[PDB]
Amino acid sequence: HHWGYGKHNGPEHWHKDFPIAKGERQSPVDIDTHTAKYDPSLKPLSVSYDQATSLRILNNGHAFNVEFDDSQDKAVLKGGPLDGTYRLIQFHFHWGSLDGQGSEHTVDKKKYAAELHLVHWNTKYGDFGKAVQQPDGLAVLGIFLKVGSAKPGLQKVVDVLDSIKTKGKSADFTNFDPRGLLPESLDYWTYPGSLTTPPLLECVTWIVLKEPISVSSEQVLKFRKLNFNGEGEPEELMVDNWRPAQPLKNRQIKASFK
Ligand SMILES: NS(=O)(=O)NCC1=CS(=O)(=O)c2ccccc21
Ligand SMILES: [Zn+2]
């Protein structure tokens, strides 16, 4: 009876095995654009992905992860609200069964069709496992996806999904350049939060880009053909693998733009 996104093991049930689900800085949250405040102390955000080395892609029964070699500073995020260097370890998406839902963060309650999470860990902690024991151990760069024109840089990902249809399957996935998933502007909102899937650890500095990327209906439709179940099991389409917005509580969301 492991956590998932169904009626019986979904978001409303997570608190039983992971009490921190009702914690003080859970994610995602709704971003009230009018209440967010421009912060002049934010340094410019630096996304340096030119040396990124992707390794493989895996369906873990919740989403699919594109994993990177994080044994050296090859793809890093720095600046903005961060102190130090954060190394890219993997990226994944959360999407819906329909275009009107799918994102985890919302903007003035508006839901996008999907959301990309590029996960990074603070290099001062030595590794991912150690970073998730720290309040500033992780930085996740979130990018909204809306349905419109196709995103060329996402097609390589789309085309390999047929090979990892079910839970547990993985495939070689080298030379994928994450720069192809970035919108033009780096304007963003930032707030302290958590992982949005169990263990829901509160170690994340969230950086959510204001500008969404556009993906085609055909690209998102292929995400929805994936399976939550393992091979040879009854088919449960992988859709709506998003956690709804959580209480903001004692937090202020800062904007990098006026
Ligand atoms: N939506 S989210 O971004 O909070 N989730 C990310 C996540 C959760 S994890 O601890 O399974 C893990 C292991 C390795 C790399 C990333 C992750
Ligand atoms: Zn995520």
Side-chain angles (χ1 to χ4, degrees):
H1 189 77
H2 67 287
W3 73 269
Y5 293 93
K7 251 280 181 175
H8 294 98
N9 64 354
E12 299 310 309
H13 290 276
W14 297 352
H15 75 100
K16 289 173 292 168
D17 277 332
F18 308 95
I20 192 70
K22 293 175 180 301
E24 291 312 300
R25 68 130 125 170
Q26 286 291 291
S27 292
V29 300
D30 170 56
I31 295 164
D32 183 300
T33 65
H34 293 111
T35 298
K37 190 185 179 183
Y38 165 70
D39 185 333
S41 80
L42 291 172
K43 290 164 177 161
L45 186 65
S46 173
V47 182
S48 309
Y49 292 166
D50 65 300
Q51 231 91 277
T53 312
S54 59
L55 298 175
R56 40 162 243 184
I57 185 170
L58 162 82
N59 173 334
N60 60 17
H62 308 292
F64 62 84
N65 300 326
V66 170
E67 313 153 341
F68 291 75
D69 163 12
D70 62 351
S71 61
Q72 308 176 66
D73 281 324
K74 279 165 174 157
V76 301
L77 182 66
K78 310 177 330 190
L82 313 166
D83 291 312
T85 302
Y86 283 67
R87 201 171 288 174
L88 178 64
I89 179 163
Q90 61 107 288
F91 70 73
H92 57 275
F93 303 79
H94 297 268
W95 61 94
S97 56
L98 299 167
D99 299 353
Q101 63 195 52
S103 62
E104 293 208 302
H105 289 85
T106 52
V107 182
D108 294 329
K109 307 283 192 162
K110 172 222 175 84
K111 296 173 159 125
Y112 284 86
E115 190 172 325
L116 166 60
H117 287 166
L118 290 126
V119 188
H120 311 76
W121 51 277
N122 194 323
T123 64
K124 80 189 191 162
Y125 300 126
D127 63 46
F128 184 84
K130 266 294 172 190
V132 295
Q133 291 172 46
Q134 322 297 323
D136 59 349
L138 301 182
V140 181
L141 176 63
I143 301 177
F144 294 117
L145 276 62
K146 66 177 178 184
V147 176
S149 57
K151 188 70 175 171
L154 178 65
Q155 200 56 38
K156 283 185 178 176
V157 174
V158 169
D159 291 327
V160 84
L161 299 180
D162 284 313
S163 71
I164 51 160
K165 180 183 205 186
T166 49
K167 177 184 184 180
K169 294 198 166 289
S170 82
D172 291 320
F173 200 65
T174 59
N175 305 282
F176 178 72
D177 193 327
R179 291 179 299 183
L181 305 168
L182 309 179
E184 291 181 1
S185 181
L186 289 187
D187 289 339
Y188 65 84
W189 290 287
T190 183
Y191 75 94
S194 71
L195 290 181
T196 63
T197 60
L200 302 171
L201 311 172
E202 299 179 330
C203 318
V204 184
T205 287
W206 278 94
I207 297 164
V208 181
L209 300 189
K210 170 206 63 180
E211 177 172 9
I213 53 163
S214 303
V215 299
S216 75
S217 183
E218 292 90 333
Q219 292 178 314
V220 68
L221 276 169
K222 283 180 186 180
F223 278 22
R224 304 180 184 133
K225 284 186 176 179
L226 292 165
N227 286 6
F228 275 136
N229 55 279
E231 192 188 339
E233 276 163 43
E235 183 167 41
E236 191 190 328
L237 291 187
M238 190 181 277
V239 294
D240 297 310
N241 53 358
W242 50 275
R243 183 193 197 192
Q246 304 297 307
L248 187 57
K249 296 196 177 179
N250 187 41
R251 299 172 285 174
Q252 296 181 320
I253 295 184
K254 300 298 189 177
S256 72
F257 56 101
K258 292 171 177 181

XYZ file of all heavy atoms in Angstrom, residues 62-114:
423
model
N 5.587 6.832 -10.566
C 4.954 8.099 -10.175
C 5.082 9.126 -11.303
O 4.151 9.872 -11.570
C 5.607 8.654 -8.913
C 5.668 7.656 -7.796
N 4.534 7.196 -7.151
C 6.712 6.994 -7.245
C 4.879 6.289 -6.251
N 6.192 6.147 -6.287
N 6.243 9.150 -11.944
C 6.526 10.066 -13.043
C 7.711 9.430 -13.744
O 8.024 8.271 -13.472
C 6.931 11.441 -12.484
N 8.360 10.159 -14.651
C 9.580 9.634 -15.271
C 10.698 10.618 -14.941
O 10.501 11.841 -14.973
C 9.450 9.416 -16.805
C 9.181 10.663 -17.607
C 10.231 11.494 -18.016
C 7.865 10.999 -17.974
C 9.977 12.636 -18.779
C 7.610 12.141 -18.729
C 8.669 12.956 -19.132
N 11.852 10.083 -14.561
C 12.988 10.928 -14.223
C 14.108 10.842 -15.236
O 14.494 9.744 -15.646
C 13.618 10.550 -12.864
C 12.661 10.655 -11.708
O 11.792 11.522 -11.677
N 12.821 9.762 -10.732
N 14.628 11.987 -15.646
C 15.797 11.997 -16.524
C 16.920 12.303 -15.512
O 16.949 13.391 -14.906
C 15.732 13.091 -17.578
C 17.114 13.190 -18.297
C 14.605 12.756 -18.606
N 17.812 11.341 -15.311
C 18.892 11.466 -14.330
C 20.195 11.919 -14.968
O 20.515 11.527 -16.093
C 19.111 10.120 -13.647
C 17.834 9.435 -13.165
C 17.980 7.917 -13.117
O 18.906 7.416 -13.791
O 17.182 7.225 -12.437
N 20.950 12.736 -14.236
C 22.210 13.271 -14.730
C 23.394 12.850 -13.873
O 23.230 12.476 -12.720
C 22.189 14.800 -14.722
C 21.255 15.389 -15.715
C 19.877 15.362 -15.497
C 21.734 15.913 -16.893
C 18.998 15.851 -16.445
C 20.858 16.408 -17.848
C 19.492 16.377 -17.627
N 24.586 12.932 -14.449
C 25.809 12.627 -13.713
C 26.137 13.883 -12.896
O 26.467 14.936 -13.451
C 26.949 12.319 -14.686
C 28.328 12.389 -14.022
O 28.417 12.440 -12.785
O 29.336 12.390 -14.754
N 26.011 13.773 -11.580
C 26.270 14.885 -10.690
C 27.550 14.686 -9.888
O 27.670 15.212 -8.789
C 25.072 15.094 -9.733
C 24.794 13.887 -8.823
O 25.389 12.796 -8.994
O 23.951 14.030 -7.921
N 28.497 13.928 -10.442
C 29.775 13.670 -9.751
C 30.786 14.832 -9.887
O 31.867 14.804 -9.289
C 30.390 12.364 -10.261
O 30.670 12.428 -11.651
N 30.442 15.843 -10.687
C 31.294 17.034 -10.841
C 30.358 18.177 -11.160
O 29.222 17.931 -11.567
C 32.256 16.920 -12.011
C 33.109 15.691 -12.070
C 33.930 15.704 -13.328
O 34.798 16.565 -13.488
N 33.652 14.777 -14.248
N 30.838 19.415 -11.012
C 30.003 20.580 -11.295
C 29.840 20.744 -12.803
O 30.571 21.500 -13.427
C 30.611 21.869 -10.694
C 30.350 22.003 -9.188
O 29.265 21.605 -8.719
O 31.225 22.527 -8.478
N 28.873 20.046 -13.379
C 28.641 20.095 -14.828
C 27.426 20.915 -15.248
O 27.420 21.563 -16.304
C 28.470 18.673 -15.368
C 29.766 17.905 -15.611
C 29.453 16.410 -15.777
C 30.682 15.603 -16.164
N 30.505 14.183 -15.777
N 26.376 20.833 -14.450
C 25.137 21.558 -14.710
C 24.780 22.111 -13.352
O 24.418 21.351 -12.442
C 24.059 20.608 -15.181
N 24.900 23.421 -13.191
C 24.612 24.001 -11.891
C 23.705 25.220 -11.936
O 23.577 25.897 -12.957
C 25.912 24.430 -11.181
C 26.850 23.222 -10.982
C 26.593 25.534 -11.994
N 23.096 25.488 -10.800
C 22.226 26.630 -10.642
C 22.882 27.424 -9.502
O 23.337 26.830 -8.531
C 20.848 26.112 -10.245
C 19.760 27.138 -10.071
C 19.442 27.799 -11.455
C 18.537 26.420 -9.483
N 22.983 28.743 -9.641
C 23.582 29.601 -8.615
C 22.906 30.963 -8.709
O 22.173 31.224 -9.647
C 25.067 29.864 -8.861
C 25.956 28.657 -9.133
C 27.395 29.131 -9.430
C 27.371 30.521 -10.072
N 28.669 31.025 -10.642
N 23.178 31.828 -7.740
C 22.608 33.162 -7.783
C 21.173 33.214 -7.327
O 20.715 32.336 -6.605
N 20.449 34.242 -7.759
C 19.081 34.371 -7.321
C 19.072 34.392 -5.805
O 19.829 35.137 -5.176
N 18.227 33.566 -5.184
C 18.128 33.499 -3.728
C 19.127 32.515 -3.123
O 19.181 32.356 -1.904
C 16.701 33.008 -3.519
C 16.549 31.986 -4.681
C 17.252 32.664 -5.844
N 19.938 31.876 -3.959
C 20.835 30.843 -3.444
C 22.201 31.325 -3.002
O 22.741 32.277 -3.552
C 21.049 29.777 -4.513
C 19.761 29.312 -5.186
C 20.106 28.537 -6.451
C 18.941 28.449 -4.177
N 22.744 30.645 -2.008
C 24.084 30.935 -1.532
C 24.818 29.694 -1.953
O 24.448 28.587 -1.573
C 24.105 31.093 -0.015
C 23.396 32.354 0.435
O 23.686 33.423 -0.146
O 22.551 32.291 1.364
N 25.821 29.863 -2.796
C 26.567 28.709 -3.238
C 26.107 28.101 -4.554
O 25.310 28.670 -5.305
N 26.620 26.910 -4.807
C 26.351 26.181 -6.022
C 25.473 24.975 -5.779
O 25.694 24.210 -4.841
C 27.669 25.710 -6.617
O 28.494 26.863 -6.848
C 27.434 24.959 -7.926
N 24.477 24.819 -6.631
C 23.550 23.699 -6.542
C 23.703 22.914 -7.832
O 23.605 23.482 -8.927
C 22.108 24.210 -6.380
C 21.785 24.694 -4.994
C 22.399 25.830 -4.481
C 20.848 24.021 -4.194
C 22.091 26.302 -3.199
C 20.520 24.493 -2.902
C 21.146 25.635 -2.424
O 20.791 26.188 -1.229
N 23.913 21.611 -7.708
C 24.148 20.725 -8.854
C 22.908 19.974 -9.373
O 22.219 19.335 -8.599
C 25.221 19.702 -8.431
C 25.964 19.021 -9.540
C 27.140 18.196 -8.958
N 28.249 19.010 -8.460
C 29.305 18.510 -7.820
N 29.389 17.195 -7.597
N 30.290 19.308 -7.409
N 22.663 20.002 -10.687
C 21.502 19.289 -11.266
C 21.625 17.766 -11.121
O 22.625 17.189 -11.552
C 21.374 19.602 -12.760
C 20.235 18.884 -13.509
C 18.870 19.329 -12.975
C 20.331 19.225 -15.033
N 20.628 17.118 -10.522
C 20.650 15.671 -10.377
C 19.622 14.989 -11.285
O 19.899 13.936 -11.858
C 20.448 15.219 -8.902
C 20.455 13.687 -8.843
C 19.159 15.763 -8.315
C 20.678 13.124 -7.424
N 18.451 15.600 -11.462
C 17.457 14.988 -12.327
C 16.334 15.965 -12.592
O 16.272 16.987 -11.939
C 16.862 13.759 -11.645
C 16.145 14.053 -10.321
C 14.619 13.959 -10.438
O 13.978 14.815 -11.033
N 14.045 12.904 -9.878
N 15.495 15.671 -13.587
C 14.296 16.473 -13.800
C 13.149 15.500 -14.096
O 13.363 14.347 -14.490
C 14.486 17.548 -14.902
C 14.599 16.999 -16.306
C 13.483 16.480 -16.965
C 15.807 17.096 -17.002
C 13.557 16.075 -18.319
C 15.892 16.704 -18.342
C 14.764 16.195 -18.996
N 11.929 15.948 -13.831
C 10.749 15.152 -14.061
C 9.624 16.170 -14.247
O 9.847 17.382 -14.115
C 10.425 14.258 -12.851
C 10.240 15.031 -11.575
N 11.295 15.394 -10.773
C 9.135 15.584 -11.015
C 10.852 16.135 -9.769
N 9.541 16.261 -9.891
N 8.433 15.666 -14.535
C 7.269 16.507 -14.714
C 6.091 15.996 -13.889
O 6.088 14.863 -13.416
C 6.803 16.521 -16.200
C 7.854 16.978 -17.190
C 8.859 16.096 -17.612
C 7.786 18.248 -17.779
C 9.770 16.463 -18.611
C 8.688 18.625 -18.783
C 9.692 17.712 -19.207
N 5.083 16.856 -13.735
C 3.813 16.500 -13.100
C 2.824 16.978 -14.172
O 2.989 18.070 -14.694
C 3.587 17.295 -11.807
C 4.610 17.008 -10.759
N 4.434 16.035 -9.804
C 5.855 17.503 -10.571
C 5.530 15.948 -9.068
N 6.407 16.825 -9.517
N 1.835 16.165 -14.532
C 0.869 16.584 -15.544
C -0.558 16.086 -15.270
O -0.783 15.256 -14.390
C 1.334 16.137 -16.936
C 1.468 14.641 -17.083
C 0.523 13.781 -17.566
C 2.613 13.844 -16.762
N 1.013 12.492 -17.573
C 2.294 12.500 -17.089
C 3.884 14.129 -16.234
C 3.197 11.451 -16.910
C 4.786 13.080 -16.058
C 4.442 11.763 -16.395
N -1.523 16.581 -16.041
C -2.883 16.167 -15.783
C -3.503 15.197 -16.776
O -2.862 14.763 -17.726
N -4.768 14.867 -16.536
C -5.486 13.992 -17.449
C -6.139 14.871 -18.530
O -6.580 14.369 -19.561
C -6.550 13.206 -16.694
O -7.415 14.086 -16.005
N -6.173 16.184 -18.287
C -6.761 17.149 -19.200
C -5.875 18.398 -19.172
O -5.169 18.620 -18.204
C -8.183 17.534 -18.736
C -9.244 16.439 -18.649
C -10.475 16.929 -17.888
C -9.614 16.046 -20.055
N -5.926 19.224 -20.215
C -5.058 20.417 -20.257
C -5.312 21.469 -19.169
O -4.434 22.273 -18.875
C -5.162 21.140 -21.610
C -4.743 20.281 -22.791
O -4.227 19.149 -22.614
O -4.948 20.767 -23.919
N -6.501 21.471 -18.573
C -6.784 22.461 -17.541
C -6.229 22.179 -16.155
O -6.495 22.919 -15.217
N -5.443 21.118 -16.004
C -4.879 20.827 -14.696
C -3.615 20.044 -14.924
O -3.396 19.519 -16.018
C -5.874 20.016 -13.841
C -6.206 18.617 -14.422
C -7.424 18.012 -13.763
O -8.469 18.662 -13.689
N -7.306 16.770 -13.283
N -2.761 19.976 -13.907
C -1.520 19.227 -14.066
C -0.377 19.854 -13.301
O 0.458 19.129 -12.720
N -0.314 21.196 -13.270
C 0.771 21.852 -12.500
C 0.544 21.683 -10.989
O -0.567 21.390 -10.514
C 0.919 23.355 -12.826
O -0.254 24.074 -12.494
N 1.632 21.812 -10.251
C 1.590 21.693 -8.786
C 1.445 23.115 -8.246
O 0.514 23.392 -7.495
C 2.859 21.003 -8.299
C 2.873 19.539 -8.785
C 3.649 18.635 -7.866
O 4.851 18.909 -7.643
O 3.048 17.667 -7.368
N 2.360 24.014 -8.604
C 2.179 25.411 -8.203
C 1.080 25.971 -9.083
O 0.853 25.469 -10.195
C 3.456 26.226 -8.432
C 4.541 25.880 -7.466
N 5.409 24.826 -7.668
C 4.801 26.351 -6.222
C 6.154 24.658 -6.584
N 5.801 25.574 -5.692
N 0.367 26.971 -8.569
C -0.653 27.632 -9.350
C -0.341 29.131 -9.287
O 0.385 29.568 -8.394
C -2.079 27.313 -8.817
O -2.152 27.574 -7.403
C -2.415 25.846 -9.116
N -0.857 29.914 -10.237
C -0.578 31.352 -10.253
C -1.946 32.039 -10.192
O -2.716 31.950 -11.132
C 0.159 31.754 -11.528
C 0.482 33.249 -11.487
C 1.467 30.936 -11.656
N -2.223 32.705 -9.078
C -3.541 33.310 -8.850
C -4.619 32.256 -9.097
O -5.628 32.508 -9.767
C -3.732 34.539 -9.749
C -2.781 35.648 -9.377
O -2.441 35.725 -8.186
O -2.385 36.428 -10.251
N -4.368 31.069 -8.538
C -5.228 29.887 -8.621
C -5.295 29.236 -9.987
O -5.957 28.219 -10.156
C -6.637 30.228 -8.144
C -6.659 30.872 -6.778
C -6.462 29.874 -5.679
C -6.798 30.537 -4.327
N -7.049 29.633 -3.194
N -4.612 29.807 -10.968
C -4.642 29.224 -12.304
C -3.715 28.013 -12.398
O -2.548 28.107 -12.037
C -4.180 30.225 -13.358
C -4.017 29.580 -14.730
C -2.748 30.069 -15.438
C -2.516 29.333 -16.761
N -3.286 29.922 -17.878
N -4.238 26.907 -12.925
C -3.457 25.676 -13.109
C -2.948 25.546 -14.551
O -3.689 25.806 -15.499
C -4.333 24.465 -12.816
C -4.812 24.382 -11.381
C -5.819 23.244 -11.188
C -5.866 22.868 -9.725
N -7.248 22.927 -9.187
N -1.686 25.151 -14.737
C -1.169 24.954 -16.084
C -1.304 23.469 -16.421
O -1.612 22.653 -15.549
C 0.314 25.387 -16.190
C 0.512 26.896 -16.249
C 0.606 27.660 -15.080
C 0.614 27.546 -17.466
C 0.806 29.039 -15.131
C 0.820 28.928 -17.536
C 0.919 29.662 -16.365
O 1.175 31.003 -16.436
N -1.062 23.102 -17.676
C -1.215 21.704 -18.084
C -0.165 20.764 -17.464
O -0.390 19.566 -17.291
C -1.169 21.629 -19.602
N 0.987 21.313 -17.119
C 2.025 20.506 -16.521
C 3.075 21.406 -15.900
O 3.004 22.648 -16.022
C 2.655 19.581 -17.587
